[PDB]
Design a protein around this ligand. Structure first.
Ligand SMILES: [Zn+2]
Ligand SMILES: [Zn+2]
Lengths: 133, 133
């Protein structure tokens, strides 16, 4: 698909399969409700890059409570609007270019030891983003 | 083998198979001399545990020039003696028990993008450690 490879160490945007914590695909089984995004493979500590050109809209945290991975952002532009979780970003507002450094992946293995480390990416309307990867 | 599972969140010690950069088995191809140890699969940022009971007997860096993974230790005791690379250890010297936290795996993807993240473990005499894993 159209998006840039998001994770510094990767040829493409590969998706988390199934590990001891769960599975990474859109609508994957979760406890209250299905998985609302897609988990894109990425090594803890890695540089993450913008999937598309647009504007960082704001900080957007994945969780209501503090943990080692509780940061992220919303980005919109070029027909796309995503929330990207488990990243410490460079900035919480302003312009960003496709493939530009967006931030660093936070300590996935500290929070979920044995997970396939990933960025969780979600369309802003919670629709399936898989086609764009 | 008698050694503890090294990588938090894994079930057992599993050896890196071949990727872009090379292969993880003992005596696998490397540039001027064969692979002197075994590469145990482990995710960047995972806790790493001591494979056996002994003494941490100093820092052992893998490389002459600094990079994100350039740390490790030597451990000896109970008739074993190993070097373990790519870990930030809890300490450089002192007692450790089999299965106790030794440290945390450094971010291999910053140095060798596309490698399977792993701990490199080597017997101090460079004999094959595979049977102990
Ligand atoms: Zn997810
Ligand atoms: Zn090795």
């Amino acid at each position: 698909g159209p998006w840039a490879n998001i994770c510094a160490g990767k040829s493409s945007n590969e998706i988390r399969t199934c590990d001891r914590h769960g599975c990474g695909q859109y609508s994957a089984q979760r406890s209250q409700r299905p998985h609302q995004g897609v988990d894109v493979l990425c090594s803890a500590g890695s540089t993450v890059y913008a999937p598309f050109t647009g504007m960082i809209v704001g900080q957007e945290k994945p969780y209501q409570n503090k943990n080692a991975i509780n940061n992220g952002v919303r980005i919109s532009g070029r027909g796309f609007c995503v929330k990207m979780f488990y990243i410490k970003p460079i900035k919480y507002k302003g312009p960003i270019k496709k493939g530009e450094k967006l931030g660093t992946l936070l300590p996935l293995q500290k929070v979920y030891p044995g997970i396939q480390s990933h960025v969780h990416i979600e369309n802003c309307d919670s629709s399936d983003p898989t086609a764009y990867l």
